[PDB]
């Protein structure tokens, strides 16, 4: 798979910035955030052409190994063959994901974790820069 980072200790309100290159023939990519691979407060999955979906942002949680209820966003500000940046923060109610074009969406915080300690990237996205504040 792709980059895995742990012991991040990202607290509420602190920003996680991730910049990467979207493959020219990208089918999808994933950024997973949470405690570990079984406990994700955000599974962020832009699907260019994957699982039957096209140009769709899919979000979900995973709690104790179990996928939660999936949600989708209508907008898709990713282009294959381009560099994309995503900035993520959270509070007790929502994750807030800020997207390249300045789009911003929220995803409910279903896990109640004190911090984001784990990030994993997968798929057609080559990570170039990760920053914390």
Ligand X SMILES: CO[C@@H]1O[C@H](CO)[C@@H](O[C@@H]2O[C@H](CO)[C@H](O)[C@H](O)[C@H]2O)[C@H](O)[C@H]1NC(C)=O
Angle (nearest 5°) at CA 28 between 24 and 32:
130
If the CB atoms of residues 18 and 42 are measured against ligand X, the closer one turns out to be 42
Cβ-based nearer residue to ligand X, 15 or 37: 37
Q: Name the segment binding its own copies (CB under 8 A); options: 43-51, 64-72, 85-93, 121-129.
A: 121-129
Quickly list DSSP for 7-65. EEEE-TT--EEEEEEEPTT--BEEEEEEEETTEEEEEEEEEEEETTEEEEEEEEEEETT
- Residue 21 near residue 125 (C-beta atoms within 8 A): yes
Residue 38 near ligand X by CB under 6 A = no
5 binds, among ligand X, its own copies, none (CB under 5 to 8 A by kind): its own copies
- Helix, strand or coil for residue 99? coil
Of its own copies, ligand X, none, which one does residue 8 interact with (CB within 5 to 8 Å by kind)? its own copies
Query: Can you tell me the distance from the alpha carbon of 92 to that of 71, in angstroms, rounded to the nearest whole number?
Result: 19
Binding mask 51-90 for its own copies (x = CB under 8 A): ----------------------------------------
Q: Is 128 helix (H, G, I), strand (E, B) or coil?
A: strand
127 touches its own copies by CB under 8 A: yes
**Which residue ranges are tagged as binding site for a beta-D-galactoside?**
43-47, 51, 60, 67-70
Residue 6 interacting with its own copies (CB under 8 A): yes
């Amino acid at each position: 798979c792709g980059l895995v980072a742990s012991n991040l200790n990202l607290k509420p309100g602190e920003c996680l910035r991730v910049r990467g290159e979207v493959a020219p023939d990208a089918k999808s990519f994933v950024l997973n955030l949470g405690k570990d691979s079984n406990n994700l407060c955000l599974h962020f999955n832009p699907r260019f052409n994957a699982h039957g979906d096209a140009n769709t942002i899919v979000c979900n949680s995973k709690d104790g190994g179990a996928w939660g209820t999936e949600q989708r966003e209508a907008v898709f500000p990713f282009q294959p063959g381009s560099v994309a940046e995503v900035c993520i923060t959270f509070d007790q109610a929502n994750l807030t994901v800020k997207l390249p074009d300045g789009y911003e969406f929220k995803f409910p915080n279903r896990l109640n974790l004190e911090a984001i300690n784990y990030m994993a990237a997968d798929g057609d996205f080559k990570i170039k820069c990760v920053a914390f504040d």
